């Protein structure tokens, strides 16, 4: 039951975050663009009835021209009875009409089909459903389900085009067997199991995996990426995304290794989906809060953002002095319709106790940037002292200042977050971890000294932080105390003398 | 250069956990049992001379009849200069006199031989020496180096005798190519690359590797456990150690499959390594702390304890509600040479707010247990109120007392600590988590109740959980205040009727 009476938004809801207006959102669903209308589509697990998971379950559905102003539109698709669930899937445009739900009146850009899991009491089963105004409202098929195993734990379509095998691809979960399993259609409804994947950290459940070409940077070459949630059991406690990187031929993924990899080394950054239609590289985003906590954090009268939608490419990285990888990389879309309120430039920056940076803007929007190249001089200091900060404050309210802070250490090499907020309470704390580091090698090197640098994007409870060019992501939420929001950011260090040269700051105050 | 002026000792120095009377204690190496002499070994990457990490850095060494009473005995192995390292490595134990040591005047049973990484700059090789006095002494091989790969990233050697291959069997990290190296040798002198092993969780490098037989609880068969520490970039932040279950033939290790699991989900658990020559069951041991912070920790004249000494068992444990898989188990060596000073026994409490486990012990030597099997009642409270905490308080000392929470949430299925203790400062603690979580599956269930078992262990300044029998393993060191340590335990819930039903309750004070 959503209790109108207290709102949250003025100091807690994100500005160019998609949130609903009210009720509970978790995984995003049915990503796509639609290229003749010109528009981004989100569809995501809705219960509007309240700020927690609960049946009825709906797909939710939202449109933005530029991935950061939002429109909330009527549900989408909604469960046959009140025990019932339209659980996670995704959208495919069916531009050849190879289900043979579309005529010639419907334009090939916009033949929409969702493939979703059906969930009912004991049964899980995967369904699919039409549209023929633009991906607002949908017709299920009269034959659903299109694939029933008798199973109560298989969920999570992924569908897309293979070009190469000329057929539909669906990655789905068997979740609880540990198994993504891969099925080849030719018009949607008929599918045929072509294989079974199982790897990386199996956790407590397989869920929401997915499969697509990534480019490599600087080159016409690509690798197959398969995703993979898994919830709970993650070794940052709860729920955690990650990937594997090989090759498909329309029957099997190959990885290249046996490795294991995370996504986003934040807390809360899980259920990641890639936009179907998209024509130049990757592009996606996720559920920015964990499960251990999602359903207790201080908002009203909703729950829940997305993460920005962010570009993935694959780079070859040092992860140690001798050794590169094929790493993922990703970075945050930001479009120029975003306003710069106000910012802070400075260059070749020699850090010191008495030389700390601290922005003196007019007002505050409470959605800031921080863009950071740094080196690390050879200067020997005392061991509390290897280390500067970026300090996120909020506004002096009731006499106190709230503040999350951003840090590197030298000797470490490592960044790190502090998001603990003393005072502020809410059920299921003690699973919401504070503390988190990042390992990184260096950027470059400018002769001898060692060069990161750090991009970094606060929208009033959410903070995602980019380690080295999208190298290394962590996305992580923050509560400050009612009323509270970001106002002033500092960068600040102990040492007397410069340990960090901060080659370039930009601090920009923005808006939608 | 250690101060003798302040002593930690009194407040920190654990009881049964082995620490250096002074200096800086790292992996532990060449573990062994002598069948003759009826004595454990333990050696230890060992700094004299600062309470940090510093060359020249050698073997110390400690002997026990009984893994908890330890006696510190002279430096075993020390570098050639004052540049240089005994690194970590193993002890075998070639009764056949394969090596051509050792003549009718060394039993059998004490034709010890040390394999270890000889660390000078740049440059890391493999090297053996001999003792001829039950492992107190050693004599360096003539032609040290025994493997020498022109490399500055090439240690940790793990040796063992394999009956089938009728052969020595060496693991060892290539450390930065993140390929551990299985070479095969007549005489531990001449030795040949056989396989190279790459999988898991990469993170920046490979150490202390293991290979050795785990009986599967219940049965005469076992499976080969490859064992693998990798630090920094641990996904909890440093150190940490993991592994995998397969099949060796003596010259390739093949796992049965490609997943990645962690050996203990706490902080600091690091380099850990088995004891040779145990005739039942595999028996291992660990560095109790993290690289990111351990030698910053507020412990003085010494730094860093072992873990307690572990028995390691396979079991077929639920891993999610469908599925078993084989699941490394521990459970900490603890035998009847320990006093019991005093006990809290205590059986079928239903948990409530009004009903709190107190102990009123006489006084306290700072080393206390819990052993607790619980069960979760139907019973509907409020979100916050889904948890018991098992609080470990200090003495009252300047008006304050300090403590750490150890708790278990029904509606998450999770064990949680919170080792935060205000007012505690120490270099690079932004990388000391304070907030850890375990997820399992029931241990059994009482008709259609949930049942779960936990074993927790405090000596001081370290603190070791058991999750269901051993099926989740949790190591965490924590500071209290200047002259705090563990009093008293409570076990407390918020719940006005009972959530939790304590089956059996055991809290020990124990002793030396
Ligand atoms: C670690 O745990 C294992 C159990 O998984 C313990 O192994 C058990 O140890 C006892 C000896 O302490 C063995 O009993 C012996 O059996 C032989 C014949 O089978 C008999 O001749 C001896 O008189 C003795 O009774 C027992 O078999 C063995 N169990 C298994 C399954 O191996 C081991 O002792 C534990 N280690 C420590 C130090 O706690
Ligand atoms: C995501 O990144 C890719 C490049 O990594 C961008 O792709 C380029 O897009 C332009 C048009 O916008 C094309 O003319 C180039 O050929 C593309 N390059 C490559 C290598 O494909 C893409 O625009 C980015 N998308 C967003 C929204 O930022
Ligand atoms: C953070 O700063 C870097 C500059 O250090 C930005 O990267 C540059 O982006 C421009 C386009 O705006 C390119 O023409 C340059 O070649 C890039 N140079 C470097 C140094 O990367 C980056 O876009 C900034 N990130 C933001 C605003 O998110
Ligand atoms: O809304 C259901 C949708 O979310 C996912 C991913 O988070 O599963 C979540 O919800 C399920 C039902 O409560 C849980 O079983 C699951 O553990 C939780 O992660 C998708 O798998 C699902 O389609
Ligand atoms: O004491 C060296 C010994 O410790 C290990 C494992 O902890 O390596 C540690 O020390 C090395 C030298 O400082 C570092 O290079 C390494 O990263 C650190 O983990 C063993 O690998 C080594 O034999
Ligand atoms: C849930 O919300 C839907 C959509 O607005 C509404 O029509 C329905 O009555 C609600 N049902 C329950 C059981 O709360
Ligand atoms: C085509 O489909 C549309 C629905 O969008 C329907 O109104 C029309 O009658 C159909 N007939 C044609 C165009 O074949
Ligand atoms: C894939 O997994 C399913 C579920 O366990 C099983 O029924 C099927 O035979 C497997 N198929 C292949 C090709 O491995
Ligand atoms: C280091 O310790 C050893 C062994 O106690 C000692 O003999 C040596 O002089 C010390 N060296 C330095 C550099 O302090
Ligand atoms: C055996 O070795 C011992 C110890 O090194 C030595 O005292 C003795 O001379 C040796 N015996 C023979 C036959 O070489
Ligand atoms: C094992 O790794 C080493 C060192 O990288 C390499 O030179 C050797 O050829 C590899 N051997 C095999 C069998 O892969
Ligand atoms: C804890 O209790 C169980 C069941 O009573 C017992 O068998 C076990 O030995 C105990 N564990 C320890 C470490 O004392
Ligand atoms: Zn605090």
Redesign the interface.
């Known amino acids: 039951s959503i209790d109108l009476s207290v709102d949250t938004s003025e100091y807690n809801r994100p500005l160019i975050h998609f949130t609903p207006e009210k009720g509970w959102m978790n995984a995003p669903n049915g990503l796509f663009y639609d290229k003749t209308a010109k528009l981004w589509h989100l569809y995501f697990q809705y219960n509007p009835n309240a700020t927690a998971w609960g049946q009825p379950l709906y797909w939710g559905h939202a449109t933005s021209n530029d991935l950061v102003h939002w429109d909330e539109h009527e549900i989408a698709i909604g469960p046959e009875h009140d025990n019932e669930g339209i659980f996670s899937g995704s959208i495919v445009v069916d531009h050849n009409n190879t289900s043979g739900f579309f005529n010639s009146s419907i334009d090939p850009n916009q033949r929409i089909v969702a493939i979703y899991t059906n969930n009912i009491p004991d049964n899980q089963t995967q369904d699919i459903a039409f549209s023929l105004d633009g991906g607002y409202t949908f017709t299920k098929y009269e034959n659903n389900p299109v694939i029933d195993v008798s199973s109560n734990?298989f969920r999570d379509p992924k569908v897309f085009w293979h070009e190469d095998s000329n057929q539909w691809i669906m990655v789905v979960s068997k979740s609880?067997?540990?198994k993504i399993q891969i099925f080849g259609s030719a018009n949607l409804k008929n599918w045929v199991l072509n294989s079974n994947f199982?790897?990386?950290?199996?956790?407590?459940?397989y869920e929401c995996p997915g499969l697509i070409e990534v480019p490599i940077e600087n080159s016409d070459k690509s690798k197959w990426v398969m995703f993979l949630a898994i919830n709970?059991?993650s070794?940052?406690?709860?729920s955690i995304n990650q990937y594997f990187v090989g090759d498909f031929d329309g029957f099997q993924f190959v990885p290249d290794?046996?490795?294991?990899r995370?996504v986003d080394?934040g807390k809360d950054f899980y259920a990641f989906q890639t936009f179907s239609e998209v024509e130049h590289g990757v592009l996606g985003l996720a559920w920015a809060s964990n499960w251990?906590y999602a359903?207790?954090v201080p908002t009203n009268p909703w729950r829940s953002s997305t993460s920005l939608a962010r570009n993935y490419t694959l780079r070859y990285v040092h992860?140690?002095?001798?050794?590169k990888?094929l790493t993922l990389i990703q970075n945050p879309v930001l479009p120029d319709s975003i306003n710069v309120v106000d910012k802070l430039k400075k260059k070749n920056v020699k850090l010191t106790n008495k030389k700390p940076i601290k922005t003196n803007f007019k007002g505050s929007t409470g959605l800031f940037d921080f863009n950071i190249t740094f080196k690390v001089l050879n200067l020997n200091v005392?061991?509390?002292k290897?280390?500067f900060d970026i300090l996120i404050n909020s506004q002096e309210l009731n006499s106190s200042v709230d503040s999350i802070?951003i840090?590197f250490?030298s000797?470490?090499?490592?960044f790190?977050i502090?998001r603990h907020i003393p005072n502020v309470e809410?059920?299921?704390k003690?699973?919401?971890?504070?503390?988190?580091?990042a390992?990184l090698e260096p950027l470059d090197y400018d002769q001898d000294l060692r060069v990161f640098s750090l991009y970094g994007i606060v929208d009033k409870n959410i903070i995602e932080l980019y380690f080295n060019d999208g190298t290394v992501a962590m996305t992580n939420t923050f509560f400050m105390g009612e009323g509270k929001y970001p106002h002033d950011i500092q960068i600040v260090t102990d040492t007397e003398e410069p340990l960090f040269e901060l080659e370039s700051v930009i601090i920009r105050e923005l808006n939608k």
Do not use: C, M, V
């Not at 199982?198 to 459940?205: A, E, I, M, R």
């Not at 992860?319 to 050794?323: D, G, P, Q, R």
């Open positions: 734990q609880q067997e540990y199982s790897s990386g950290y199996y956790g407590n459940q709970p059991g070794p940052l406690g709860g290794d046996s490795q294991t995370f080394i251990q359903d207790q992860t140690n002095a001798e050794t990888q005392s061991p509390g290897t280390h802070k840090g250490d000797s470490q090499s490592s790190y502090d809410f059920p299921r003690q699973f919401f971890t504070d503390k988190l580091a390992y």
